[PDB]
C-alpha cells in the first residue's frame, strides 16, 4: 500500500539476450498467486478452492509462453536493423512500432478468458496503449485502469458462475484488482525489459521515453564508450577496485544525435560491486552512502555555495553570473530600463552571443583546484566552519527549535568541518572519481578523469560554477574597471554580451578569438557564435529561450515551457491547483513590462500563456468530469485570483496604472471564447462580464 | 459615533494671560448639562427631575471657581520665574510640578459630593495622575477611567438616594460615564491650557511632553520668530489673505537649547481663518483640505517617489541616499564584509562624519525647482501619469478587482495629471507657502519663506531627498566613476565616509571645504565634524544611534529604541502582537553579528532587546488581566515564534551555526529567570526549558 503502477522499474535494464531461451513468466504459479494475494490483501485458508480456476488459467498462460519463438516474431515483425552508429538516435524503435509488438505478444500469450470476455479485452487495449505513453515516471491511478471493466466477464474469479452473496462480490473485485496489477506491475514490464533497453532522454522539455533495442543497445554503447574514452578517460588496471574512491555508473542520454556521458554515483563501496548481494551488508552500505551525503557532500557543497555568494555580494564580476534562465531576462529587462532613463531612447545594440564547447567534459582540473585553494587564500587550515541543513538556506515556515508544545525520520543534526578536511574532499571528486564500464562480457574496464570532472556527482555542478565565474573574473577583468554601459552575463556555459560600444564589443570578441579562454576548460563553440554589429539587421535573435527583440530590448519566453499535466492530477481541485501555480509561475515581470508601446506584444504573450493553461482545463475536464463533482462557484474564484494576479503584477512590473483598464478586457474576452460553448459554463460567461476595477 | 479619550485638542494653544480675569468654567450650567447629556446620550423630556442635583453641584463649583484667586496660587505653589533665553527647554516645568498643581485646583473647585465619596476620591487623583504622563497624544481608553468607580457614592446622580428599578441604574451609569467625560474633556484640557502650553518635542526617540508656561511661552516665541525671520523669512502684508494659497499654523520646538521651526497646515482655506467657526462650513473645509491630499498632493508625492526609485535603480550615486538607520547598518556590514573578502583583515579606515546646519531651513528653493524639472528632462508636458494609492504599492491581499461575486465610503478611483500641472503644485508648496503667527492681541503676522521650504508639509519631506540626492549625484561623481573601495551613504542630513585610500579620502574633504556645495542649499556645519586620518585617534564615532568601532566596523546600537507601548494595546492579544512586532524590528543582524569574537556581546544585545520587552509584559499584565483573559498556551505561541526569529536571524546574518546552540540556552535562561515567581506561569517554565534545536 503505497503508490501505483511507475516506470522506473523498467527503466535502465541491459542484458545479453538469447531469444532462441526466454520466457516471460519464469516465476512459479503459486509464487505469482501470492503476489497477487499480498497486494490484494486476501489471506485464504487451506481449504479454500476459489483460486482453482485462476491456477488452471495460469497454465495456458505459461504454456503460451513456453511455446513462443520470440526471436522470430521479433525479427519478422519489428525486424533486426543493423546499428547506425553516426546518428545514435535513430536506433531505437519508435513508440508506434513498440505498441504493436507488445500487443502481438500478448495476443499470443492470453487466451481470451484471459481478457475477461471480447468487450473488456479491447478496454485493455486501450489503457495498455495509454500506458506505454507515459513519460517521466508518470504514474497512473490504479483505479482508472479498473474503470469501465465488467466483472461479470471474469467467470474464473470464483468457484460460482453467479454472482449471489455480498462476500462474493468483495472476493471477486479484490482478486480482480490484483489480476490487473500483476498484468502490468509484473508481467507488462517483463514483456517490456525483455525486447528493449528503456532510457530516460536529455532533454529537459520533453519528457518523452527512447525505446533502444537491447542488442543496438550494445552497440550504441560500445562505440560511443569507446570514442569518449580516447578524448576523456584513461583505462585502469584491476588493482584500483581495491581501494576507497568515489565511484559511479557510466550511462548515456541521447540528446537529438548524440549522447551525454553521465555519472551516476552508487550507493556501495568501491571493494565491493563484485557485486555479492549479501542481504545485510547492502542496506548498511546504502546508509554509509547516505551518511557521506548527510555530513559531508551536502556540507560541503552548502558551503561552497555560501562562498560564491559571499564573492557575489562582494564582486560585481561574479554578479554576472546568474542559475536560471529567469534571472537572464531581469537582467535584461533590468539593462533596457537603464538604457531608457539615460538616453530617452534605445539605442544601436552590438550583439555576441556563444557558448562552450562541453564544459564538465573540456574541464581543466589542475586550474579548477588552483581556484578552489584561493577561495581559503587567507583563513589557516584549522578553520572549522560550523553548518546545518535546512531547506531555506540553501542556494517562509521555518520551524528549527523543537520544544515539548510544538515538533513532537532524521531530526537535522549540526555538521563540522574544518579547512583541510574540505579542501581534500574536493580532491577526491575530481581526480580520484571513478567510472565503471561494462563490455561484452561484463569485465572491469574502469576508467579515471582525464581532462575535467564528471556529471551527476553532487559536488560537479557547483565546481563549474566556481570555476567559470572566476574565470570571467580575470580573463575580463578589463570589462569591470572603469566599467561603462555594458550587459554581461552568463547562466552555466552560455554567455551573452549586449552593448551600444563597438569597441567595447571588439574587445569581447577578440577574446574569444584569442586562446586565453582556452587556459581554463573552456573552449568556444566558434559554429554557433551569433553576432549583430551595425550590418547585419536581426530584430529577433533567441538566447535561452527568450525571444528578445533587438532595438527595444522586449523579452517574449518561447514554447520552453510545459503542462506536467495529466499525471497526479485527476480532481479538479488538484489540476486547479498546479495551473494556478504553473500560471502565477511563467507569468513574469519582463513579459508584463510595458515602459515602450510595446503592449501589443504583451498581450500576445499573456495571450499564449492564458490561452494554454485554459485550453488544457478543458482537455482535463471532459475526461475527469466522469467521476469528481464540479463546483462552478470554485473555478471562477480561481478565475478572479489568477486576473487579479495579472493585474496586480503587471502594475507591480511597469510602475504605472496606465494601461490596466485594457489589459484585464483581453483577459475578460479570451474567458468568454474560450468557455462559451459548454452549459456547464454557463455561470462563467455571466460573472467573468462585470469584472472591474 | 465616538472613539474615546484624545489630546490633540490640549495642545499647541497660545493666548495672552490676563489672570487678574480667567474662569476655568466659562459656559453656562445649562450648556454644561447639554454637552454631558449629548456625550451620554439621554434626551430627557420637560418635566424631568433627574438632573436637579447636578445643576446644585455645578453652582457651588463654579462659586468656588470665581472664588479662587488662580495668580496667587501659581506663584504661591509652582511660582513665576525669570526667563531663560539661553536654554529654551528649561523653561518648562517639570511635570512633577505640574501633576501637584492641577489636583490643588481641582481640590478648591470640586466640593466631596462632586469627586463622588472618599473610596472614589482617590481612585479618580490615580487617573489624572496616570492622565498627564500621556505623550504623543497618548490619551486613554474611557473604559479603563471609569473601572472601579462605585455608582453607590455617587448619590447627587438621582433625586432617590437607593438604586432599586432597572431604569435607574442605567441612568446613573450612563450620566457618570458622561460626568467623567466632562471633567478630563473640558474641564482638565481647560486647566492645562490656562497654566501652560502643550507642546510635543522634537525628539523622536523620547514622545515626553515640554510644558512651557504661556506667559512665558509668548517672551519665547517672539524672540526666536523675529531672529528666525530676520534669516529665512519675508513678512507679507495684510492683502495675501485674499487669495487661495497654502497655508499653515507656525510653531517652535525645542531641541537641546534652541528650537526648530515647523509649518504644521491647516485643514481650511486661506480665505477663512479669519476665524468664523460657522459650525457647518468648518467641516466642509475639512473635506476640501483632505480631498486635495487624497487625489492631488498624494498622487503628486507618490508619483515623485517614483521618479527617484527610477534613478536609485540606475545610478549608484542615488543609491547612497538610503531612508533608514537600518539600511545605514546593513551598507556598514556590507562593506566590512567587503574589506575582510578582498584583504582578509580589516585594513585602516579613514572616517569622515558631517551634518548640515539648517538643512530644510537653510535650502535653495531656486536649485530645488531645476532638479525637479530635471526629473522630467525627457517627457514632453503632456505625459498624464496614472497613479492608484495602495497601502503596499507605494515607498499580499492586494484586491483591486470588484466584479459581482467578490468585494460588494470611498472606492479609490485613479487619477490622472501631466507633467505641466505637478511642477506648478512642487512650486506652490515651495513659495506660496504661508505661515501665521498669533501675537500677545492675535494678529496676522504672515511670513513666506525667503531661503528653503517649510518642514510639515507633506512633499517637503521627499523635496528635500529628491534635491539631496540630486547634489550627491553631480557634485561627487568623480567617486561613482571608476569606482574603488570607498562607502558612501546619507540619510537626511548626516554624511558618513568611510575608506582606507588617503587620496580619495582629501578629495571628498576639498569639497567641503570649497563652496561648491553652496550653490545648493547645503552648509557644513564645521563646528561638528568628526574625522579620522591616521592623526586622530577615535576608536569609537556616533553617527546615526549607532556607535561603529573603528578598525573593526563592528556595530552596537545604543539607547536609542522606546517601546510604545501602553497606547492601544490593551487586550493580550493586541500587546503581543506589537511587542512580537517590536522584538522582529528592532532585533537586527548586526546585533547579532559573530564574525568576530563578539559572541558574549551578542548575548547581552539579545538580553537587552529580549528583557525590555518580557519585563514590558509583566509591568501590564498585572493591570490588563483585571478584564482580559489570559491564554497561557497563545503567550508560548508568541515566545515560540520570536525565539525561532532570533535563531534563524543570527544564522542568516552569520553564515554559520557557531554559537548557535549556546544563543538558545541564553534565551531560555533569561525565560525561567522573568517567569519563575508568578503561578499563572507555571506551564511556562516547565515547556521552555525543553527548548531544543
Known amino acids: 500500500v503505497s503508490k501505483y503502477i511507475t516506470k522506473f522499474n523498467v527503466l535502465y535494464n541491459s542484458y545479453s539476450r538469447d531469444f532462441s531461451r526466454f520466457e516471460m513468466i519464469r516465476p512459479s504459479i503459486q509464487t505469482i498467486l501470492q503476489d497477487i494475494l499480498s497486494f490484494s490483501g486476501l489471506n485464504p485458508g487451506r481449504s479454500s478452492k476459489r483460486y482453482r480456476g485462476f491456477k488452471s488459467l495460469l497454465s495456458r498462460i505459461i504454456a503460451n509462453d513456453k511455446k513462443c519463438r520470440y526471436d522470430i516474431l521479433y525479427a519478422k515483425f519489428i525486424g533486426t536493423s543493423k546499428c547506425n552508429f553516426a546518428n545514435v538516435v535513430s536506433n531505437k524503435t519508435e513508440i508506434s512500432q513498440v505498441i504493436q509488438f507488445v500487443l502481438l505478444v500478448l495476443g499470443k500469450l492470453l487466451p481470451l478468458d484471459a481478457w475477461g470476455g471480447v468487450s473488456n479485452k479491447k478496454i485493455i487495449k486501450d489503457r495498455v496503449v495509454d500506458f506505454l505513453l507515459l513519460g517521466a515516471n508518470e504514474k497512473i491511478h490504479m483505479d482508472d485502469l479498473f474503470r469501465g471493466i465488467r466483472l461479470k466477464d471474469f467467470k474464473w474469479l470464483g468457484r460460482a458462475h453467479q454472482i449471489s452473496s455480498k462476500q462474493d462480490f468483495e ?35 520533453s519528457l518523452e521515453l527512447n525505446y533502444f533495442p537491447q542488442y543496438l543497445w550494445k552497440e550504441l554503447y560500445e562505440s560511443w564508450v569507446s570514442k569518449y574514452a580516447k578524448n576523456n578517460l584513461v583505462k585502469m588496471p584491476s588493482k584500483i577496485q581495491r581501494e576507497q574512491l568515489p565511484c559511479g555508473k557510466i550511462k548515456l ?57 559571499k564573492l557575489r555580494d562582494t564582486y560585481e564580476s561574479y554578479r554576472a553570473s546568474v542559475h536560471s534562465s529567469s534571472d537572464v531576462a531581469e537582467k535584461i529587462s533590468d539593462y533596457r530600463d537603464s538604457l531608457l532613463t539615460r538616453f530617452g531612447e534605445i539605442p544601436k545594440l552590438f550583439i555576441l552571443k556563444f557558448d562552450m564547447k562541453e564544459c564538465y567534459d573540456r574541464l581543466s582540473q589542475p586550474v579548477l583546484m588552483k581556484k578552489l585553494e584561493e577561495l581559503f587564500e587567507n583563513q589557516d587550515n584549522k578553520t572549522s566552519y560550523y553548518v546545518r541543513y535546512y531547506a531555506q538556506l540553501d542556494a517562509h515556515n521555518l520551524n528549527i527549535l523543537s520544544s515539548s508544545r510544538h515538533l513532537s525520520v532524521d531530526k537535522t543534526k549540526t555538521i563540522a568541518l574544518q579547512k583541510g578536511n574540505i579542501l581534500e574532499v574536493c580532491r577526491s571528486q575530481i581526480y580520484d572519481v571513478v567510472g565503471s564500464v561494462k563490455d561484452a562480457r561484463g569485465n572491469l574496464h574502469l576508467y579515471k578523469r582525464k581532462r575535467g570532472v564528471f556529471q551527476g556527482f553532487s559536488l560537479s555542478s557547483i565546481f563549474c560554477d566556481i570555476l567559470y565565474s572566476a574565470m570571467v573574473h580575470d580573463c575580463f577583468q578589463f570589462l569591470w574597471k572603469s566599467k561603462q554601459d555594458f550587459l554581461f552575463v552568463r547562466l552555466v556555459d552560455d554567455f551573452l554580451l549586449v552593448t551600444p560600444d563597438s569597441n567595447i564589443y571588439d574587445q569581447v570578441h577578440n577574446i574569444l578569438s584569442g586562446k586565453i579562454l582556452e587556459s581554463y576548460g573552456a573552449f568556444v563553440n566558434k559554429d554557433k557564435t551569433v553576432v549583430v554589429n551595425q550590418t547585419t539587421t536581426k530584430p529577433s535573435i533567441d538566447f535561452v529561450g527568450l525571444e528578445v527583440n533587438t532595438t527595444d530590448l522586449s523579452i517574449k519566453r518561447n514554447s520552453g515551457s510545459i503542462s506536467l499535466v495529466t499525471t497526479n492530477f485527476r480532481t479538479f481541485k488538484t489540476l486547479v491547483k498546479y495551473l494556478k501555480t504553473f500560471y502565477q509561475l511563467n507569468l513574469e515581470g519582463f513579459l508584463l513590462d510595458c515602459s515602450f508601446g510595446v503592449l501589443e506584444n504583451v498581450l500576445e504573450n499573456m495571450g499564449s ?13 471532459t475526461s475527469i468530469v466522469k467521476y469528481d463533482t464540479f463546483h462552478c462557484y470554485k473555478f471562477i474564484k480561481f478565475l478572479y485570483d489568477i486576473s487579479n494576479y495579472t493585474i496586480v503584477k503587471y502594475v507591480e512590473t511597469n510602475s504605472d496604472w496606465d494601461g490596466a483598464p485594457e489589459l484585464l478586457n483581453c483577459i475578460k474576452q479570451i474567458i468568454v471564447k474560450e468557455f462559451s460553448s459548454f452549459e456547464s459554463y454557463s455561470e462563467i460567461v455571466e460573472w467573468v462580464q462585470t469584472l472591474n476595477i
Open 609 to 621: 500563456l492564458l490561452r494554454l493553461v485554459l485550453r488544457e482545463f478543458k482537455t482535463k475536464f
Open 253 to 309: 542520454i541521447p540528446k537529438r544525435s548524440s549522447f551525454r556521458v553521465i555519472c551516476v554515483p552508487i550507493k556501495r563501496s568501491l571493494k565491493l560491486l563484485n557485486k555479492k548481494l549479501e542481504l545485510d551488508t547492502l542496506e548498511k552500505e546504502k546508509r554509509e552512502f547516505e551518511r557521506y551525503r548527510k555530513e559531508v557532500l551536502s556540507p560541503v557543497g552548502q558551503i561552497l555555495r555560501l562562498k560564491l555568494s
Open 171 to 205: 472476493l471477486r473485485t479484490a482478486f480482480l484488482k490484483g489480476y490487473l496489477w500483476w498484468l502490468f506491475e509484473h508481467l507488462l514490464k517483463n514483456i517490456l525489459r525483455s525486447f528493449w533497453y528503456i532510457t530516460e532522454t536529455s532533454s529537459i522539455v
